[PDB]
Amino acid sequence: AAAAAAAAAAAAAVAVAVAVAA
Amino acid sequence: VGYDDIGGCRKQMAQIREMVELPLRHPQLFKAKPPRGVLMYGPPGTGKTLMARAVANETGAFFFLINGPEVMSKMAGESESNLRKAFEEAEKNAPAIIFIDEIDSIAPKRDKTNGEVERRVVSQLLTLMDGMKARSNVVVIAATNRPNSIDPALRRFGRFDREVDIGIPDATGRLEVLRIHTKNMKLADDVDLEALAAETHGYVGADIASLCSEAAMQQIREKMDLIDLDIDAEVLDSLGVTMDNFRFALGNSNPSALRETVVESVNVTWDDVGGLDEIKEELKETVEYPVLHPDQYTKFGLSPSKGVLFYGPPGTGKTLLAKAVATEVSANFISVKGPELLSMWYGESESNIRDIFDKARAAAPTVVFLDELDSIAKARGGSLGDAGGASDRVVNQLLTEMDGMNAKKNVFVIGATNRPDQIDPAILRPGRLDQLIYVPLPDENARLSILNAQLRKTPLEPGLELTAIAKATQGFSGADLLYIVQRAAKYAIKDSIEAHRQHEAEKEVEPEVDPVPYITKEHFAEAMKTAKRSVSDAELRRYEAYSQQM
Amino acid sequence: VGYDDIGGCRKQMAQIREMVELPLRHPQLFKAIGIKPPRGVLMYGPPGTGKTLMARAVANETGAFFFLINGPEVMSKMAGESESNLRKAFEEAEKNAPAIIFIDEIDSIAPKRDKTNGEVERRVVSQLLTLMDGMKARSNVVVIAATNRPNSIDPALRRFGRFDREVDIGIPDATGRLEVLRIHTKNMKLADDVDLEALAAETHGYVGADIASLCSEAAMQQIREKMDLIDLDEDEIDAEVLDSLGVTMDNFRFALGNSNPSALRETVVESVNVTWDDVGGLDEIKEELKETVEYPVLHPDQYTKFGLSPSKGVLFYGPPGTGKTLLAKAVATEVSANFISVKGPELLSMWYGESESNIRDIFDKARAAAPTVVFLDELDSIAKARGGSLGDAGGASDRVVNQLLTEMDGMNAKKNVFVIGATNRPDQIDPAILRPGRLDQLIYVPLPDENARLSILNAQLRKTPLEPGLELTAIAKATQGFSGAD
Amino acid sequence: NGPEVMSKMAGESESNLRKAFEEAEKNAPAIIFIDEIDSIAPKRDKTNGEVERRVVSQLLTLMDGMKARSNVVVIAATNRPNSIDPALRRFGRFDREVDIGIPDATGRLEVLRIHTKNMKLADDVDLEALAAETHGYVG
Amino acid sequence: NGPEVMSKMAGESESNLRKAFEEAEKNAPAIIFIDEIDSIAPKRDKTNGEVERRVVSQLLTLMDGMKARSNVVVIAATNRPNSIDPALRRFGRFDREVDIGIPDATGRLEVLRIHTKNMKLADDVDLEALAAETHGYVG
Amino acid sequence: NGPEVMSKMAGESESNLRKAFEEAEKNAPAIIFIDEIDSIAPKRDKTNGEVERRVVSQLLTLMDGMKARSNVVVIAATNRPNSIDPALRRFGRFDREVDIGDATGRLEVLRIHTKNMKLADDVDLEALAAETHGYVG
Amino acid sequence: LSMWYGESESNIRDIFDKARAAAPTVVFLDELDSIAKARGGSLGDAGGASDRVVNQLLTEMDGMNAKKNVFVIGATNRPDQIDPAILRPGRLDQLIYVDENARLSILNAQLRKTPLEPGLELTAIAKATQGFSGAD
Amino acid sequence: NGPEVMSKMAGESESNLRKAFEEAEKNAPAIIFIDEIDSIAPKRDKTNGEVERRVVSQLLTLMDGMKARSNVVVIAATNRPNSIDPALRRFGRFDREVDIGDATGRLEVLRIHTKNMKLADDVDLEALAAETHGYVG
Ligand SMILES: [Mg+2]
Ligand SMILES: [Mg+2]
Ligand SMILES: [Mg+2]
Ligand SMILES: [Mg+2]
């Protein structure tokens, strides 16, 4: 008989940065 | 359940008869070649399974049902055994018809799925569909709820040639399905299905059945809770569904597509929005004609505007008008605030805006209220795309999904912003959000109307005057007037509570309705001592400059 | 358990009772009206509200056999074995008798069929859809489901024919809490002093299991206050102390003062000991705040008699240290309504959208456990005038202030949530926030006068030994420009 | 232990949890200690996998569902309570939360006495001075 | 090694760590060396995944827990101590953090003497001057 | 290759690197060319992804450690050598840094690239070596 | 435009890259005055952005040889505020100056797919409206 | 074709590619037609699988390994001109692309298709080939 298997690795996120003007 | 049970899809049904019924009883005229498979797609609850059962019943051809997710097994390779045994029995017995329900369980695009039994069964099914002699004339019936999650290998010539978009019905289709479902039950005479179909907008296929069942349920409760039947022949035969049951069911029910986005009830009327008479007239002119008089559109030959933008100082009634439209327009309404859709993950934000607009198109006609557009449709500027171009991608998706709404879609977008300066000018281009209504500060008569609309449900002193209040409040706003009324009410409540305290004190040491019966002259006089203007003059100057620039 | 155990939900009780009883008590009536009844219902609401209790009551009362399915329980390791489990359950239920299926924690079995990426999961979703709808879909079988997050369910399952009615098992009213208290305080023995009406009145966000916890804690306090006089008595406990326990009203008061609503358990404020007598001066401000906070929560009949709505927001502004945060602490300690203490920049986050997600979560908790008090310290940190920032982090501050605007005034209800702001720089606050209907009361807290400095000094010396001959009038007369901090 | 329950097979972590709870319940009134619960039981709304959500649901129904429990007490230990599913922070599942916090001067003196009771100490030791001078020590 | 234990399936990296620890403890008293631990175990609060949190919790439970260790010594090596879970930097897990920093002039002298022990050198060169001249060279 | 070995599955790119190093060490003394190493060395402080730090630690483990390398030399390739880890630019891993950045060499490349074909008799390579002043090779 | 150093120039740079990639093409720059603004002197962040935009436009238009044959079309209402540095010879030298008959043709082209009344003449609207435009 | 290269056997894809390339090099100087290359080459950045990367690397190392004595060319058809690897569009494998943006072929396709039916007696397929502009296949 056959069998299944589960797998959950990761994803991709988004960051936000702050800048300084002059 | 024969061919006469499915309704509202005469044209789509007509192709089905031509596609599978006529070429199956006589292949001579086609030879003098019908496909070996037909796909049906559309929103859930559109009579797919109903049509499959009607064709299965009306034609005496043998029927072998293989539910999509029920072909696999635990033992090694028994899924393949099931599938080829199904096809071989379908061929060997007779020129049969096979119906595969929920194909998505069998063909998950072969792009994300990394299993092995799924690959084996999909490839074997492809080979089986390849092998079909033209003489057997057996055809397969497929039923998918979501058409874009299909293995494109099946979407090729010789494999499921012609698809049939079983969509939502029109008004006539809704009336037809209403009749079909309500013909068995005993419907009282004082009922006209035409009105119910003209008021029913987004319901499709099964939701109409839900409506009828709910109305019947309410009637049964009306004739069970009161009588207290606790068998009773006289109670049994005295059952008839009247109009109020259907009205209640319509007021309680919701299109299944908009089930997730149920909105809290805020009942507003057009007499609650004091003032803004011309604005209300223009809004009605814009929203009721495209949805009720298509003949006018056909005669004119001019595309009506499919958007509008409210802008003005805070506390003027933009959200109030949005609420009034949501409650008393006789069409669907999905409210969204700007920041709700954004998500930290990659793609989710665009998937969410895509899903919301898909729901809007599904429950057509709809009115999508974008409140505070200054957060999702901000000016492009020089932000550098510090968030991986997330904001840029969101605005780009919004533009592509707002410009791709043809006339048939009938989706009206309501905009409302406090600061129009940060709106991307691309939005204001014609064809997306052309019309822009400006909500100015109330005048004296508008202020009087606002006060009368806000003091509608408030017991008020018979000897009272409001023109004085109107004349005094000069640069005030609707929110400011609300503040005045609430402060006066709070003073009245304070007087009531202290008076009740005193009365109880010398009572314990039949009561009237209250020691203080009405809002009083002195209550308003003291409430008006602490009323300050909401918006200053600088904002008024800037809004006037923007208006004059337009 | 029975139908007299579930309390605080009468409409929903009738809604499920109808579906469970009428098609199994008067089938002739439904054949006479002609149509079949709905045969699918989904129970949803916050956790610990009574959905599983109602399912248990239905299972005990209805005379047919009852099958219970926990969510993840169906799945198994062998390929296509969960499908077999679901098929076996449904076929046995149909074959044996007319029956009620109960699917506990449906969120585990219907993960939207679009965001999931596991094939077996989408196989189980499709199998459930087929079993609940299709050829010979049902023959006198009804399915009840329970969930805490109904929006995470595949819409195909939420269609007529599969799940016709969605019952909302929500937070109870004061009468609901009174009913729950009367239900849970029956078997136990109470002293005459107990007043369940007052207990329900001062309970503000407790739902179901919260009330149960309150009762249990009260009993625990009684047992742990009336066992010290006796020894441990490990061998046996004698009848004279075994009898006459009597869970007192002081025990109930203590248990109510210790506990907090389950919703606000994540944002429980640290205990602070301030009182109205601890705040010197500001007589008009304290009385205005007291009447504006206690009127809607204690006297709703007058508001409904006038049919208007109460004032919600308030903004303190003035020089630093004048007593704004002190007033907020006094409100937190004295007022009966729940307190949500949040700092200014606490809720911001580096990710995209998580600031507004946090704001939405905080305000959702506030309106869930209503009546609630939310303190926004230094509103000028998060709510600044829009468009000023030439260079910004993708306009995150603008999005935050817009989120605040829409949540404090938008397409929502007025569940009695009071926003208090405390900032010493009212020039940086955006004008939209200061509109009436969002923050309508701008209270200026000026520098103390002579009698206010005297009151402050006495308030701060209320727990300190002092010289008998010492008078504070000279100190007050000598500090002219001073503040409370000075 | 926290991650001891998870397995590669789909639908096996919940099977392990079920076996553990049934074995615990079949015997006398027992105690189940779950160490490092931040791993088993995260918030379902914030997580993105599927097996963790299913494990959380299995744990929830085992803790409080129809036929809830029979004289079985569950103890949990964690370093972060805010990263736990709100449905688990409820009466019936985890009704009472004890806060094991930093000791004070007397507590630290007790800890010193306990930890210096089995060794061969000198006569010159005053544990009071040590408990005074040690300030932020967690024990 | 650091990344050698990680996997894609749910519940396999923790199984690898359990196998390693139990194999080590089965035999005579042993030494375990987790090279580049900072890759395995970053701060839990500042990570988005789930497998990293589970493996961090597994390390915590393995080193500290009911019947944690018996004659088994654990050694670690890292370059970024501050980027480690503070719950890991406690007595009972990593009792003392030895700072293996750059050597002094004498230390560099011994390093030169050690390295130049096998190659045939000429008499003229004196390693003391070289050690004095080198300042920042390490190992 | 750089972007080829990197994947989204946890513990697979490190497994691919370990398989490549085991394949290079099983048969013979060979030459390893890891191309575009700047994409898989984000200096462990500017990046946010865990898989990049995990494969950085895998490279530092496979290049140096207990019985790390047995008669095998590794070669790298990058455009900006400043975005590499300081433990990677150490002795034993990348102990030699070669700057491969003129007219006679360009003429040599023209002579060796036109060797297997008879172009003509009157073609002068001086103008072809002087006019293509910005050709990399 | 972009209130950032690089972006507001990268847009024009990759616009001209898309233009030179699909040769031949026509780049219709509508409302030139809003872009150029005669950079001159403004002494601010907006002045610096305008000067950088004008310098990017000049250095990405003057680099067009006989190859790639691009063609820039401009249109404006106010010709006063356009930069004489962009009206110079060698970059953009043509000046096309742009009535009743054109108004009648515009009214007849706008009313093509319209069910008009047969008893109606548009010459009265053409004669009454003199200084109007197609948008109005 | 594109998706006809996978089999249950592990590594069959690479063996099938090597078999096809060695058959085309063994038989004659010939031409290989790879239709629908967008399935084999998933652009290598948006994909997450591992056998797709392996079959793309096999097609890369098999297209590059053609010497002068092979004398074989390859032809490849695609639908979208954007979902192709630049490593596949690099100099050496695919550099000469055509942009097929007629009436005679449409009349030929009409006379191919409609010649198997009892059609009519008063039909002119030249008008059907002329008035049809954008149809294909
Ligand atoms: Mg169906
Ligand atoms: Mg509004
Ligand atoms: Mg429950
Ligand atoms: Mg303060």
Q: Give the per-residue SS3 of B300-350.
A: HCCCCCCEEEEECCCCCCHHHHHHHHHHCCCCCCEEEEHHHCCCCECCHHH
Grouping H, G, I as helix, E, B as strand and the rest as coil, residue C295 is helix
Kindly identify the ligand whose nearest atom is closest to the C-alpha of C377: 4
C-alpha–C-alpha distance, residues G97 and G110, integer Å: 23
CB contact under 8 A, E54 and D8: no
After which residues is the backbone of chain B broken at C–N > 2.5 Å? 32, 230, 509
Kindly identify the ligand whose nearest atom is closest to the C-alpha of C322: 4
Cα end-to-end distance, chain D, whole Å = 23
Nearest to B117 among A2, A11, A17 (CB): A2
CB contact under 8 A, A16 and B117: no
Where does residue B203 fall: left (phi above 0), alpha (psi -120 to 50 degrees), or beta otherwise?
beta
Nearest-CA distance E11 → chain A (Å)? 9
C-alpha–C-alpha distance, residues C213 and C252, integer Å: 11
Residue H59's identity, in one-letter code, is L
Listed in sequence order, the residues at least 6 apart from H63 whose beta carbon sits closer than 8 Å to its beta carbon are: H74, H88, H92, H93
Under 8 Å between Cβ of C128 and C86: yes
C-alpha–C-alpha distance, residues H68 and H88, integer Å: 20
C-alpha–C-alpha distance, residues F97 and C38, integer Å: 77
Nearest to E10 among A8, A11, A13 (CB): A8
Nearest to H16 by CA among H4, H28, H26, H27: H4
Nearest to G16 by CA among G70, G54, G66, G73: G70
Tell me which chain C residues have a C-beta less than 8 angstroms from the C-beta of A1: 78-79
Helical (H) or strand (E) element with E34: strand E30-35
B146 Cα–ligand 1 center, Å = 12
Q: Which chains have 3+ CB pairs within 8 A of E?
A: A, D, F
Q: State whether residue C350 sits within 8 Å of chain A by CB.
A: yes
Nearest to D8 among E12, E18, E53 (CB): E12
Largest CA distance in chain C: 96
Chain D: residue nearest E60 by CA? D36
Nearest-CA distance E59 → chain A (Å)? 19
Under 8 Å between Cβ of F93 and F60: yes
Q: State whether residue D45 sits within 8 Å of chain C by CB.
A: yes
CB contact under 8 A, A8 and D49: yes
How large is the C-alpha radius of gyration of chain H? 20
Q: How crowded is residue G112: how many other Cβ atoms within 10 Å of its Cβ?
A: 8
Nearest-CA distance D71 → chain E (Å)? 24
Under 8 Å between Cβ of B325 and B414: yes
C-alpha–C-alpha distance, residues C229 and B234, integer Å: 70
Kindly identify the ligand whose nearest atom is closest to the C-alpha of C379: 4
CA angle B42, B46, B52 (to 5 degrees): 100
What residues does B436 pair with on adjacent strands? Answer: B309
C283-298 helix and C324-334 helix, angle to the nearest 10 degrees = 30
**Residue C202 DSSP code:** H
After which residues is the backbone of chain F broken at C–N > 2.5 Å? 101
Residues having C-beta closer than 5 Å to ion ligand 4: C 325
What tokens appear for G28 in the block? 């219709």
Grouping H, G, I as helix, E, B as strand and the rest as coil, residue G28 is strand
Q: Collect contacts of B15-19 with beta carbons under 8 A, ≥24 apart.
A: B15/B162, B15/B164, B16/B51, B16/B55, B16/B164, B19/B162, B19/B164
Number of residue pairs across B and G with CB atoms under 8 Å?
20
CB contact under 8 A, B110 and H3: yes
Nearest-CA distance H77 → chain F (Å)? 25
CB contact under 8 A, F54 and E6: yes
CB contact under 8 A, F7 and H45: no
Chain C: residue nearest B453 by CA? C308
Per the annotation, does E79 bind a ligand? yes
The resolution, in Å, is 3.4
Under 8 Å between Cβ of E93 and E57: no
C-alpha–C-alpha distance, residues B18 and B8, integer Å: 18
C-alpha–C-alpha distance, residues B412 and B306, integer Å: 5
Chain H: residue nearest B126 by CA? H4
DSSP assignment of G57-74: HHHHHTT--STT--EEEE
Q: Give the per-residue SS3 of chain D.
A: CCHHHCCCCCCCHHHHHHHHHHHHHHCCCCEEEEECHHHHCCCCCCCCCCHHHHHHHHHHHHHCCCCCCCCCEEEEECCCCCCCCHHHCCCCCCCCCCCCCCCCHHHHHHHHHHHCCCCCCCCCCCHHHHHHHCCCCCC
Task: Write the CA distances from C383 to C205, C366, C425, C479, integer angstroms.
Answer: 29, 19, 11, 35
Q: State whether residue C396 sits within 8 Å of chain A by CB.
A: yes
Nearest-CA distance D8 → chain E (Å)? 5
C-alpha–C-alpha distance, residues C288 and B409, integer Å: 54
Q: CA torsion, points D59, D62, D68, D70, in degrees to nearest 10?
A: -110
For this PDB entry, the determination method is: cryo-EM
CB contact under 8 A, B120 and H49: no
Tell me which chain A residues have a C-beta less than 8 angstroms from the C-beta of C350: 15-16
CB contact under 8 A, F7 and H48: yes
**Residue C340 DSSP code:** E
Nearest-CA distance C43 → chain B (Å)? 14
What tokens appear for E57 in the block? 């919790």
Chain H: residue nearest B118 by CA? H8
Q: State whether residue D29 sits within 8 Å of chain C by CB.
A: no
Per the annotation, does B318 bind a ligand? yes
Q: State whether residue B284 sits within 8 Å of chain C by CB.
A: no
B63-67 and B97-101: which strand pairing? parallel
Bond preceding residue C371 cis, omega within 30 of 0: yes
Q: Which chains have 3+ CB pairs within 8 A of D?
A: A, C, E
D residues 94-113 lying closer than 8 A (beta carbon) to C: 95, 97
B262 Cα–ligand 1 center, Å = 24
A residues 1-22 lying closer than 8 A (beta carbon) to F: 7, 9-10, 12-13, 15
Kindly identify the ligand whose nearest atom is closest to the C-alpha of B49: 1
C-alpha–C-alpha distance, residues G118 and G114, integer Å: 11
Listed in sequence order, the residues at least 6 apart from G88 whose beta carbon sits closer than 8 Å to its beta carbon are: none
Q: State whether residue A16 sits within 8 Å of chain C by CB.
A: yes
Nearest to A15 among C79, C118, C350 (CB): C350
CB contact under 8 A, C77 and D10: yes
Under 8 Å between Cβ of B77 and C84: no
Tokens 């290079």 correspond to F24
CB contact under 8 A, F8 and A9: yes
**Residue A7 DSSP code:** B
CB contact under 8 A, B382 and G7: yes
C-alpha–C-alpha distance, residues D53 and C111, integer Å: 10
Handedness of CA B286, B290, B292, B295 (dihedral sign): positive
Tokens 């000023």 correspond to C388
B149 Cα–ligand 1 center, Å = 17
Residue B296's identity, in one-letter code, is Q
Nearest to C458 by CA among C445, C473, C443, C444: C473
Nearest to B272 by CA among B335, B334, B319, B309: B319
CB contact under 8 A, F3 and H44: yes
CB contact under 8 A, D14 and C212: no
Under 8 Å between Cβ of C367 and C360: no
Under 8 Å between Cβ of C446 and C318: yes
Q: Which chains have 3+ CB pairs within 8 A of B?
A: A, C, G, H
Bond preceding residue G24 cis, omega within 30 of 0: yes
Q: Which residues of H touch B (CB under 8 A)?
A: 3, 6, 8, 49, 117-118
CB contact under 8 A, E57 and D47: no
Q: Give the per-residue SS3 of chain F.
A: CHHHHCCCCCCCHHHHHHHHHHHHHHCCCCEEEEECCCCCCCCCCCCCCHHHHHHHHHHHHHHCCCCCCCCCEEEEECCCCCCCCCCCCCCCCCCCCCCCCCHHHHHHHHHHHCCCCCCCCCCCHHHHHHHCCCCCC
Under 8 Å between Cβ of C222 and C276: no
C-alpha–C-alpha distance, residues C388 and C462, integer Å: 47
What residues does B142 pair with on adjacent strands? Answer: B39, B100
Under 8 Å between Cβ of E63 and D4: no
Nearest to C436 among B44, B146, B479 (CB): B479
Per the annotation, does B442 bind a ligand? no
Kindly identify the ligand whose nearest atom is closest to the C-alpha of B310: 2
CB contact under 8 A, D44 and C107: yes
